Amino acid sequence: KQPATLRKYCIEAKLTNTTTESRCPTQGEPSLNEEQDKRFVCKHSMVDR
Amino acid sequence: FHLTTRNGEPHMIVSRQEKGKSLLFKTEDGVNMCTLMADLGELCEDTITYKCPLLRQNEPEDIDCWCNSTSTWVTYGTCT
Amino acid sequence: FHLTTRNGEPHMIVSRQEKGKSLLFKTEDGVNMCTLMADLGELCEDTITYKCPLLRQNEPEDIDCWCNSTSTWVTYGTCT
Amino acid sequence: FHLTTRNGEPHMIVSRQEKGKSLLFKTEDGVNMCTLMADLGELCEDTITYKCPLLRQNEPEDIDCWCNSTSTWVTYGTCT
Known part of the structure; x- marks a missing residue:
């Protein structure tokens, strides 16, 4: 009866409000405030400009 | 399209019926x-x-x- | 755009400068x-x-x- | 930009606010x-x-x- 829950695994998800930000060569790493919102998945990369 | 802002900068919410026309x-x-x-589709x-x-x-x-x-920000849905 | 046909049906060869305008x-x-x-680009x-x-x-x-x-057929290039 | 010379040849010290404009x-x-x-940034x-x-x-x-x-020499910083 009511045994301790160890971990919840998500097995299916959806994505919404995808947002992109980028800076020119020389001007450091860009950022988005939603990068501080735990409900978002984010990635940092480099791209030709 | 609905004109709003994102951090002082202009932001365009573009709907489906605007595909192909100068904004x-x-x-x-x-x-x-x-x-x-742009995959520009229906706003969703x-x-x-x-x-x-x-x-x-x-x-x-x-x-x-x-x-x-x-420089302007733009937003649109991809649904169809 | 160039209007031609494909098996009796109308066919549209759409160029780049027509993106966003009613045909x-x-x-x-x-x-x-x-x-x-539409990836609508340059005819190539x-x-x-x-x-x-x-x-x-x-x-x-x-x-x-x-x-x-x-009903109409359409054709366009994807080049840029 | 500050116009100076480098061995008889013209030299341009280009600042950040000139990025994108004809010199x-x-x-x-x-x-x-x-x-x-040009990585053209702030003079540093x-x-x-x-x-x-x-x-x-x-x-x-x-x-x-x-x-x-x-022919002209050019100099600029990369800082941001």
Whole structure:
């Protein structure tokens, strides 16, 4: 009866409000405030400009 | 399209019926003309949002959105 | 755009400068208005060709091209 | 930008606010127009300095700076 829950695994998800930000060569790493919102998945990369 | 802002910068919420047409909106610095060349579909939950750079006498490369007077953010759905 | 045919049916060769504008062409059954919402780029070797269905009082779904009076074929390049 | 010299040749100290604009400066041989296409950032300790070749009716290749009347040296910082 009511045994301790160890971990919840998500097995299916959806994505919404995808947002992109980028800076020119020389001007450091860009950022988005939603990068501080735990409900978002984010990635940092480099791209030709 | 609905004209709003994102951190002081102009933001365009573009709907489906605007695909293929020049986007014009007045700004203190004159009239701004952004060009949308985007998967542009119906406005829904699946949005994407990104920036349309200012481009002065330069050919566009690796982009499908750009304005010629003032950098603008754009948002549209991909649904159909 | 260049208006030609494909097996008796109207065919539209759409160039880059028409992105975002209503496509109109006269036909025995009145004036036809196709709507192109497409990766539409410059006319080149990399073409794609497909059909724009007739849509009477129905919302479009899973398509980026449709006409409202007579089904039409469309062709455009993807180059930039 | 500050116009100075480097061994008899004109030298341009380009600041951040000039990114994207035609660089013009008078010279005995008429008006010189250099084009800067550079990582151009804020003037600081991390400078780089190099030459912008003269280019008469030739397309530029493997360069981001060139003038059309008199070869010029250019210097700018990379800070941001």
